[PDB]
Design a protein around this ligand. Sequence first.
Ligand SMILES: Cc1cn([C@H]2C[C@H](O)[C@@H](COP(=O)(O)OP(=O)(O)OP(=O)(O)O)O2)c(=O)[nH]c1=O
Ligand SMILES: Cc1cn([C@H]2C[C@H](O)[C@@H](COP(=O)(O)OP(=O)(O)OP(=O)(O)O)O2)c(=O)[nH]c1=O
Ligand SMILES: Cc1cn([C@H]2C[C@H](O)[C@@H](COP(=O)(O)OP(=O)(O)OP(=O)(O)O)O2)c(=O)[nH]c1=O
Ligand SMILES: Cc1cn([C@H]2C[C@H](O)[C@@H](COP(=O)(O)OP(=O)(O)OP(=O)(O)O)O2)c(=O)[nH]c1=O
Ligand SMILES: [Zn+2]
Ligand SMILES: [Zn+2]
Ligand SMILES: [Zn+2]
Ligand SMILES: [Zn+2]
Lengths: 193, 193, 193, 193
Amino acid sequence: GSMYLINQNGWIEVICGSMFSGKSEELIRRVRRTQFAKQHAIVFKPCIDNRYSEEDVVSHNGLKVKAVPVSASKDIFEHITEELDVIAIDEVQFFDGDIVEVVQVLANRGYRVIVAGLDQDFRGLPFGQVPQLMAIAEHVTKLQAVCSVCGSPASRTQRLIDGEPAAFDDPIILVGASESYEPRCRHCHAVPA
Amino acid sequence: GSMYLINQNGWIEVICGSMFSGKSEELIRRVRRTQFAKQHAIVFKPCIDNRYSEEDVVSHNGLKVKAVPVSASKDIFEHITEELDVIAIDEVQFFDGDIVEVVQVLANRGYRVIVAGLDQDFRGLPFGQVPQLMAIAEHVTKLQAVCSVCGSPASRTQRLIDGEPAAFDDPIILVGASESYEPRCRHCHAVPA
Amino acid sequence: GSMYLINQNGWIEVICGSMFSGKSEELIRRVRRTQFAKQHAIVFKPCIDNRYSEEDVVSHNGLKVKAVPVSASKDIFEHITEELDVIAIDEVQFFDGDIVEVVQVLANRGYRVIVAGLDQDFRGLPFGQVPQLMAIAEHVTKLQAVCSVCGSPASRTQRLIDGEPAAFDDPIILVGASESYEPRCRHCHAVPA
Amino acid sequence: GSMYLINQNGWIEVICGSMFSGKSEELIRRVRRTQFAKQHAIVFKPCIDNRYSEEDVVSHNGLKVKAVPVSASKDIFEHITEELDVIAIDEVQFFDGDIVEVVQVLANRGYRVIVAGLDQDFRGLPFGQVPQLMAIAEHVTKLQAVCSVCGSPASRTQRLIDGEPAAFDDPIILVGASESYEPRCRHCHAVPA
Ligand SMILES: Cc1cn([C@H]2C[C@H](O)[C@@H](COP(=O)(O)OP(=O)(O)OP(=O)(O)O)O2)c(=O)[nH]c1=O
Ligand SMILES: Cc1cn([C@H]2C[C@H](O)[C@@H](COP(=O)(O)OP(=O)(O)OP(=O)(O)O)O2)c(=O)[nH]c1=O
Ligand SMILES: Cc1cn([C@H]2C[C@H](O)[C@@H](COP(=O)(O)OP(=O)(O)OP(=O)(O)O)O2)c(=O)[nH]c1=O
Ligand SMILES: Cc1cn([C@H]2C[C@H](O)[C@@H](COP(=O)(O)OP(=O)(O)OP(=O)(O)O)O2)c(=O)[nH]c1=O
Ligand SMILES: [Zn+2]
Ligand SMILES: [Zn+2]
Ligand SMILES: [Zn+2]
Ligand SMILES: [Zn+2]
């Protein structure tokens, strides 16, 4: 018919869902495939995100990838060469208001942009600009973890403090607190005041 | 092991993408499957949406389903029985600010809520509350049409007026205008001023 | 990064599952997308397959596409031009032993070959050479209908004769018989002797 | 509508594709999800399969799961309790002729059976009884690796001996040979005689 199938580079993939749904696991396999395709990739993460590492992007499955920690979205530009093909960003919900513009510029320029972040905070509220990234992206993969109460598929992150469901208005940083995060379905998700 | 697999009803599925990506085609097959499963379904659409029908939900593939046209989101409640299992809503981007609350209430109540709508307007801007519906939904299916210029997969709706790309600020209703809508990829999508 | 993404044409997509799982519905949407991509497509079907049409490929959803009815697999070659990009074949389980070779030759030559057929006969046995097509294909989409007894997803075709489950060894053509076919899950599927 | 969604347990999932497509990576994430769902799982592998481990199921991503090595398919039965919910089998293409019967019996009994194996040998031939498992399974996931020559998605395992493509009739065990296996697309896959 016609030997080759020419297409245009440059698009956005969103990976979203609750904590432990596998966003970074999935970000990491996508970026790995990229290295076997002999393409050049870079991975960004927000400074604030230090749960498992300051330097790296780490999945709770135990796998990691080297990353560039960044404090404003527009700082991504300074790390970008023409040589690179793929830009991956983990924990995008923690990025400033620029992130949509940054990502659209990059996709318009020919970069494959892979973006992973929480769809919702612990309260069930749509998170950062993840909603907007979802709307504008060519691909959206919404992952589900397992509800830690009932076993069926989850779609929420449950914040617990001292073992009780967190309040709606509990600050994101509680200094000496014993807090924990687990996935739940919408029926076990509990947000009281 | 264990004869049966009990799960909890009540969740949200979003179907989104550009015009002609197949949102209503997909909404209609989902609702059909429902009838073979001997479940009861109802389909809502906005009053404003009269492209192919006032009464019905119609796909450009030529298939249709009976629907209830509604002018405010909260009017859905008056049409709901306990007997019904599935609530489908086409063209959700045209619904008022209540729609998220309406949908979350319905899913919390045990209804399977299937929601179809544009992710973006003709300008590439995230559309209504579709972004928020995407964030909060258990499932998101983002469909792609074919770019009518270059043939590769699309993610945008191109508005043309008199054959030229529409302006950014062109009103949604142009009285005697000759306008048309076609899918495009991000590279052929053209929004000038 | 790198403006364009060159790939090689020529591969095989299999669509399989029970009767009424949507194989032809899915074959037809794939072929339609092809026409909007301004590519040329041809659709083959076996002579034996006349349930809804002698001439055409028809889905129980009511949609159809023009087809070329063929009695041996190797007859496909006589209908193929260089101009065409896509070859679709419905009801592949009814094709002779050549079909795998025919399909592999076509994919090696640069054609996109889309193949739809039953994975299993009414007895639950792997059907024709669909198993082999599945093994060798780049893409396999296994569709599920709804179990007409219990409502959960199906994976089997139930043959009924006079309302009772057919026997294992009941001929495919029973002359004046009142027979019917419905999808079932593995638990409701009934094959006695 | 109706509080709960009762379904029947017992079905078959096939994961197939070339070497390095991620079959064990995918088998391992499925089995992990199972542990968070507080279900009991067991993983089998063939004795012959000792590439990374005698005891365990290992993915080239570096992740592993404890397994029970087995020499005949019917030996699976001796390891099965009523307490367990999930049976996973890696490298199924290396299992004897019983495997289909073993798997169908297990799914009919209520077990969730997850089966991973090569769709094709290094020659492009459909592998073991993987074709039959594909036909009869409720779910088929056909994974793709990256072609190590050209970068586009692969569907074949290339066997190389001394750096040259292996012959069609080269034995599976070559005693002191320097052999290697890499994924390729159908165009770079090379099987001479
Ligand atoms: C299904 C499930 C998996 N897991 C484990 C096994 C998975 O391989 C692993 C996936 O974890 P992650 O990949 O780290 O989850 P996440 O990536 O969405 O969060 P982040 O972006 O900050 O890293 O988590 C859980 O801890 N709980 C669960 O319910
Ligand atoms: C791929 C493609 C399909 N089609 C046709 C064939 C598809 O079966 C059909 C799908 O159309 P619809 O299903 O009507 O598209 P849409 O549903 O997203 O919009 P709405 O909600 O308002 O109804 O469109 C196009 O017109 N252009 C295209 O590029
Ligand atoms: C889910 C379901 C759908 N349907 C209807 C609605 C679907 O849109 C339609 C799909 O039918 P088809 O597309 O014709 O099913 P099939 O294509 O697999 O068989 P063939 O290749 O010979 O044509 O069937 C049923 O009849 N029973 C069901 O259980
Ligand atoms: C895409 C790609 C990944 N990889 C790496 C990264 C993946 O995370 C990892 C997946 O490897 P595996 O999961 O081990 O591949 P496989 O599981 O299909 O084979 P087996 O059943 O015997 O274990 O392989 C390659 O080595 N080559 C490739 O082309
Ligand atoms: Zn729960
Ligand atoms: Zn285009
Ligand atoms: Zn059933
Ligand atoms: Zn190749």
